[PDB]
Symmetry: C3
């Protein structure tokens, strides 16, 4: 690959945030590898945040995002156009705000929260809340909130309008000199973005889709060296609909495409739309051959390719754990079936008592598990430890780990554990686990409903230190041979070259 | 009749419009005949239209309204009072509008539709739509429409106010120099007019009824030579409630007074109110003796008189049609039972295929007929040709015509067809057809449910050219002897003279 | 008692009003007796009225309130603080109002009611209603009322804000120079007072409870000579929650504490809260030993004391009535079971016809009694005479009187009648009647469901003039011996001294 290649990759997803994992981790690391191979791979997002600067800076400070990865955001782009049209700050905006606050007395609620009342009439005028570098000002009309101005570092970046139910129905974004550059309608019911007005260019759009199609045609040169990769399934139409004639388009599916918990044969509606149009773009990528194989029968398309996530080999713990500890790391999600896990930890501890179960995670499964834990009185064995910033020093504490998930794209959490020499006991589900857990040499695969069979193989190893240690080391080394950076990279480059 | 008579007739109805037929046609022609006999007969209306000038001009251009017939409208009257109180245009109104639009940028939607956004705050200010000589300006508040200004020739004539559901709850009417002369409350639910404020006279009224009672006492001199004729049943209370001591009052009923599709013996509520008060005014007029007869038993009143509509004899077609074509002209209305018609055209064409059925009309029966047409697969026989501006050159194309109506006042469409020498096959219903279709000499009457008996007599004549031609000529000439202008006029004059 | 004692009693209740009886009568007279014994006893209220001055003046003019009794009201207090901070009238408030009314025409509705419309646009601006010394101005926005300014003697005292449903959601109170001193949120659904802003002191409160707790700590010196008596059960938390360490606190229960019409054993929720905290204050007072006795078992507290209302002996009528008249005085309330009364007056008059039944009262039982009266056709015997300002000259007209009440605190109306030498026939209910009607010496007690037994003893006396006269005189004198001022007063003083 030409160190001076003019190839560039644009990887698309709705938003980035701190403490948001999932495919964005896969995007971050994938960007890192492309740059290492001298192909810049940046990220494109389509949502509004007044503090994206702080968010990206923090993602890089925490080592989650490679320093070379840029994020291109649609509102930032028009903000930058607006910044270069005015050469004088919008004082009138501040005057407008200041005028509405004159003739008021202040009544404090607490140190950064006060209300303001007209001193002639006693009418409720404003609510002001201040925290650190942020400030919100809420204006009232007939004692109902109508507007909120949001500030960062004493500069307005956003104004919101509220309807009779006190929900947002309109937004304005201001540039760094105080000028409005975009406004847009919000449907108060569901929060869907509607008509979008690009004020700085005197142009209207039907909605954010139309806005971003336009943005991408400005952002991404129409050359065969421009590569677009859409990871966010919700964002695929933005890519699909541009008028690029020469730039390449790929869509990546990160999850099982079958609808969750269905016997109809139902496919998730977005991922089905992406798959069905595979022959209208350069390619749809899935993480396993298993999934690629299922698709080629099910659908009449051919442009389906298998490319695994890159895998990064962190250093293993210095010490094998031997205390009968076994943990679970995950978001608290229905599809990871932690409900079965507690019903196996129930089983393990009726038979062997000194085993305990450490659970890290946050989500819609936590407080109906906590209640599930002591309904059957098990919280001196089963522990629910909340969120994990450092889920590698949690791996060191574990002898083995468990996965009761029914639906995965690849199961990276299971791979990541094997890297720390911590062997895995998990369901034989699609897709992922069947590949990198070799039954009886680095961890166990069970067939997916037999939580009883899970009892045996789990407490087997929680009292066999040497088979615990040897399998984890066979689990780490297996990963290294199976998922090499150079192998993945090559599959990418063959697609781009055509 | 004195060519210098001071008699004048005021004929009342809610509104006039282009493409609105029915009794207004009867009013138009009736006015024409009264003027010919040297008695002016003008029309009074009670609704608001900013473009009534254009509407009346067009009605006269199209030859629907006699050039001598004036329309007196209640809002026009107060508009004219306001016009003579101010001698300087209302610049402040335009300044008010212009002020709210300053400091905006424009964002086009299409060539005559743009939106306006405050350039300091980005707030949505206005929507402007322009077409030819008309313009509407919509102002927004918290991103919801609150007001609409309507323009004709760049002059405001109306302002409307909108509630939270974006429905009108208040209206203002402006005179030709821009001054508000009337405002009024609207009930957003049903559109009923409420409190009405006559600003130019500093006076309030309970509602449009009270307003128009007042108007009529100003418009119509209280002399025995002032004659009021109420045609619009909805407008009867306006007439009934004035304090005129000397002016004559008549009400005309144009329809069957029995409630439609009823077995109770139910009378339409308005027409019952008019009938019950017949002995409290000079007279209630119905179009047939049949109907007059039914009333005199049913009710304890005597002032019921029969006077037919005037009938105008247009020139007949030069040629008899002989192609097996037979048509239906009507609004698409439940009471004209076109449902039976298609179920007779079904019958005719199972027996004789080369017959086809041309249907002109628009209404609430059209798209459940179109579907009814091909559910039984008949659209190469039965044709639905939309609206008719020239329903006489449609008469020429026909050999005969059909009426499946169950409820009529007289059945003028059936008479009008006979004039074009096109004989009629229609139900023997009340009221009208029993009079001017002589069974077996100019057309057929069937008894009203036997659509099978209709099959026989219809396709009889669609293949008997000479009985088709002779009956139509017997149908035209019959009309001429039966309904003469001089005969009708005389019945009117005897009422007025008493 | 020291004529120079620094003892003072503060008696608490939500509001005072004219034509509002009940415990406020008991408070009025109780105040009178304390002052006579040289201990000032004033009243504290917690609601807003712009005309409290007129109301108190009228209560004293009518001899209902002792001239020495002051009323301390929470809003008056802050009004007075505001009055002493400004030394210039708030002209801007009047300018604000005047500005919104300029450029309008007036349209009269009647002599004190007019509407105002902008003369440039015709928009509805205001509604003004004037009566005597009061005026309200309503302002409109998009033809919906948003604000009402209330005036007394041409000075604003209140401004109200209206929501989309035209209900109050915010109030402002202005001082006598026109300055806003308090504003507060109203929940439009139920009318509950919320966040309260004491503008004159730049301070906020959670609600009226928090406001009044604060008020009472300012109003009532924290000394053992400050005595707080809470009569209004709704107002007990205001007293209970102050931080007074030294001032005494008593709560008085005026009614049966059992929930009305219940078989569960349910206690009225407020009175239960007061009773349960009896040992946390100086004492809970009930009107009878009977009720005190029921409580000491039912609850685990001891600070329950019995002290009767003071009783005032008005002069008796000069003449015994002997016409068979027998009356009922009461508010028309479910708990006084006038339904049974009419079903005894039914019984009395089937047997003796010349007896009639005079009923004075107003309430939620009147119009389902009127209908109940002639459904059984009895209004030439049973009479419903409306409200009574002079219920002593109604006592003179009566030979005896009746009470069918199931629930009482003491039954003062029954006592008051005996004073006029009018003996009572009433149910033996709790609490009260068992004490001061001695069965067979001054009136009759029946057991509470036997309305038939009531027939006998009633018409017995309506035809025994001498037993009617003698029992009433035994009824008057009994009261005098039983309920002496000095006896009551002494029970109070022993509590205060401890």
């Amino acid at each position: 690959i030409d160190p001076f290649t003019m190839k560039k990759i644009f990887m698309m997803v709705h938003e980035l945030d701190v403490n948001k994992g999932g495919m964005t981790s896969s995007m971050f690391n994938r960007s890192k590898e492309f740059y290492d191979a001298d192909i810049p791979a940046d990220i494109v997002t389509f949502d509004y945040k007044g503090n994206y600067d702080e968010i990206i800076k923090a993602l890089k400070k925490q080592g989650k995002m490679d320093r070379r990865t840029k994020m291109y955001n649609v509102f930032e782009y028009f903000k930058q156009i607006s910044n270069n049209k005015h050469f004088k700050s919008n004082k009138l905006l501040y005057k407008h705000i200041s005028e509405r606050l004159k003739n008021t007395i202040e009544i404090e609620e607490s140190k950064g929260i006060s209300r303001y009342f007209d001193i002639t009439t006693g009418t409720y005028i404003a609510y002001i809340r201040k925290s650190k570098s942020e400030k919100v000002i809420d204006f009232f009309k007939d004692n109902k909130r109508i507007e909120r101005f949001s500030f960062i570092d004493n500069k307005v970046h956003m104004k919101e309008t509220f309807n009779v139910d006190n929900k947002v129905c309109y937004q304005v974004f201001y540039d760094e000199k105080g000028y409005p550059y975009i406004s847009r309608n919000i449907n108060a019911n569901n929060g869907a973005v509607g008509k979008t007005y690009v004020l700085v260019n005197k142009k209207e759009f039907k909605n954010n889709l139309a806005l971003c199609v336009y943005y991408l045609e400005k952002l991404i040169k129409d050359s065969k060296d421009s590569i677009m990769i859409c990871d966010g399934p919700g964002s695929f139409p933005k890519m699909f609909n541009t008028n690029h004639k020469n730039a390449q388009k790929y869509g990546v599916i990160h999850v099982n495409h079958h609808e969750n918990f269905d016997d109809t044969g139902a496919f998730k509606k977005s991922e089905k739309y992406i798959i069905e149009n595979a022959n209208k773009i350069n390619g749809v990528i899935v993480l396993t051959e298993a999934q690629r194989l299922d698709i080629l029968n099910q659908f009449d398309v051919e442009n389906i390719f298998t490319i695994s996530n890159f895998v990064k080999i962190h250093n293993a713990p210095k010490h094998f754990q031997t205390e009968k500890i076994v943990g679970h790391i995950s978001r608290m999600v229905p599809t990871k079936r932690i409900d079965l896990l507690i019903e196996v930890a129930e089983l393990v501890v009726k038979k062997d008592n000194a085993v305990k179960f450490h659970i890290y995670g946050e989500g819609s499964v936590k407080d109906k598990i906590a209640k599930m834990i002591e309904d059957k009185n098990l919280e001196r064995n089963v522990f629910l430890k909340g969120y994990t910033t450092t889920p590698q020093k949690c791996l060191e504490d574990f002898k083995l780990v468990v996965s009761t998930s029914q639906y995965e794209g690849q199961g990276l959490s299971m791979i990541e554990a094997m890297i720390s020499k911590r062997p895995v006991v998990a369901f034989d589900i699609k897709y992922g686990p069947s590949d990198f857990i070799e039954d009886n040499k680095n961890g166990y695969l069970i067939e997916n409903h037999n939580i009883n069979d899970m009892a045996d193989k789990i407490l087997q190893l929680v009292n066999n230190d040497v088979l615990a240690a040897e399998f984890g080391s066979k689990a780490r080394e297996n990963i290294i041979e199976k998922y090499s950076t150079e192998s993945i990279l090559e599959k990418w480059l063959n697609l781009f070259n055509s």
